[PDB]
């Protein structure tokens, strides 16, 4: 069980850790989060009480180093940092724990939600989508644009999601225009799975990462990426049975976790109606169709 200590909490802020969140008061003696489950990526996220604009946060994996949060009064944000001195770090964490100035990661033993949302998400893949190679953790916020959004303007601060475009030479083989546009199987299976992602695990990892960035930061480009990757599978007549079964589980947990009040801005009516009711896979997503019909029948 790993720990992300905080130097201090000088400004009033809502702190998220994965799907959980806590209010911290200005100068509250808060010194971090303990009992963080090893084996998963995690995200620690922030919304200042004085500017409910710019949700921002850090993807990390405690197996890759010792990370802490320290407020920077110049840049006006909570920053993740790596402590290279193991003994200094263990000594800091031990003191804060002894003085019980840390919140405990509040996982219910029965509850597989975070595993289910991050099953295929790997820090090494996150670091290729979010480029800042001198850090082992990745910063994301509400306003960061995607490589695809930028094509249609600072490349250093971009989300490098795999570009998916249904009306592109990449998507459409010369002489198979109608076939490839109406059945995207060659785009899914040959271009994306065999060609770019190498396997379904990497494809699902990016899909799950895009969802989480859409949900935790209201990142619009991430929401577009999540929908495009769902639509590419649902619009393919030929998908491996194991991928469809796994996709139904992935989407079920995503729809289960979404705040009920954000369905209007985080769910694309056209994509979901097409995927559940018109697409080749309209009868392959039983769990997802049942939770969507019971939780968001308005959207449909």
């Amino acid at each position: 069980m790993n720990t992300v200590p905080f130097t201090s909490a000088p400004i009033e802020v809502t702190i998220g850790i994965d799907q959980y969140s806590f209010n911290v008061k200005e100068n509250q003696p808060f010194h971090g989060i303990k009992d963080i489950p090893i084996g998963h990526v995690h995200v620690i996220h922030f919304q200042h009480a004085d500017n409910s604009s710019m949700r921002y946060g850090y993807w990390f994996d405690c197996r890759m180093g010792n990370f802490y949060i320290q407020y920077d009064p110049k840049d006006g944000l909570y920053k993740m940092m790596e402590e290279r001195d193991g003994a200094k770090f263990e000594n800091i964490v031990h003191n804060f724990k002894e003085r019980q100035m840390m919140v405990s990661y509040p996982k219910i033993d029965e509850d597989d939600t975070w595993y289910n949302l991050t099953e295929f998400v790997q820090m090494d893949k996150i670091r290729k989508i979010v480029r800042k190679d001198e850090n082992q953790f990745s910063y994301v916020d509400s306003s960061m644009t995607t490589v695809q959004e930028n094509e249609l303007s600072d490349p250093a601060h971009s989300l490098n999601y795999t570009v998916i475009n249904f009306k592109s030479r990449e998507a459409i083989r010369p002489g198979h225009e109608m076939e490839d546009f109406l059945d995207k199987s060659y785009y899914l299976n040959t271009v994306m799975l065999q060609g770019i992602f190498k396997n379904s695990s990497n494809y699902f990892g990016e899909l799950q990462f895009a969802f989480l960035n859409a949900m935790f930061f209201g990142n619009y480009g991430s929401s577009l990426q999540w929908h495009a990757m769902i639509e590419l599978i649902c619009s393919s007549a030929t998908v491996p049975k194991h991928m469809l079964d796994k996709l139904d589980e992935i989407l079920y947990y995503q729809i289960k976790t979404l705040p009920e009040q954000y369905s209007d801005i985080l769910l694309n009516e056209r994509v979901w109606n097409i995927c559940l009711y018109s697409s080749f896979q309209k009868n392959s997503l039983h769990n997802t169709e049942k939770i969507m019909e019971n939780k968001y029948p308005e959207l449909l």
């Binding site: 009306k167 030479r169 546009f181």
Partner: protein, 237 residues
Amino acid sequence: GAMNSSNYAELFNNDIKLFVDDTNVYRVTVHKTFEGNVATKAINGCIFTLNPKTGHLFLKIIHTSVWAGQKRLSQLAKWKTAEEVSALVRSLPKEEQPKQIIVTRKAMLDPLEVHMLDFPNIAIRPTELRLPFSAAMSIDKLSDVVMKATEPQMVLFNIYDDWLDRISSYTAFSRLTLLLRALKTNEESAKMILLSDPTITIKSYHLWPSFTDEQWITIESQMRDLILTEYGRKYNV
């Protein structure tokens, strides 16, 4: 974006453009079977591809053999249209390729955009205009070459005959749209108006009769009267 009443003069500028109408590509007769079920029989169709500035019409004849053994023909008809338009653009020298293609039906946008990915600088546009190009098969000489075709064939016409020697392309397009609107509303009455005086003939190399400027004004008046009457009938007003 969309071509409308507001940006109408754009049709007659010096940027090459084509209208594409797909409404006569897939044509059927509906009939009863021996068992009393209903079946369709395809007949020859055409793509109507028109330069509104020059009058150049690229009439691609769609022979019934292209539907043999195919499913979802009304959907295929849109893609076959887009394939043939794309093939036509590729066949033209670069300096003759359109800068814009305007489709008369919004269902052609995606098929044509996908077939034209190799031409990112050619704009594919819808129109809010309700153009009467469906009535092209009321022009006897166009109808005749479509129905006689025994194989796929491209036939080139000038839909304005020699009018551009005497009038602008705005006026020629207005005349064409009024003739086609009339032919669409009441074909029998429109053709009676066009042929009633046997002294005015259609030249072998023309589609329409050889009216003087004065006779065109009378013809154009008779067509407008035909259209308003028919409207009062349709709508009891």
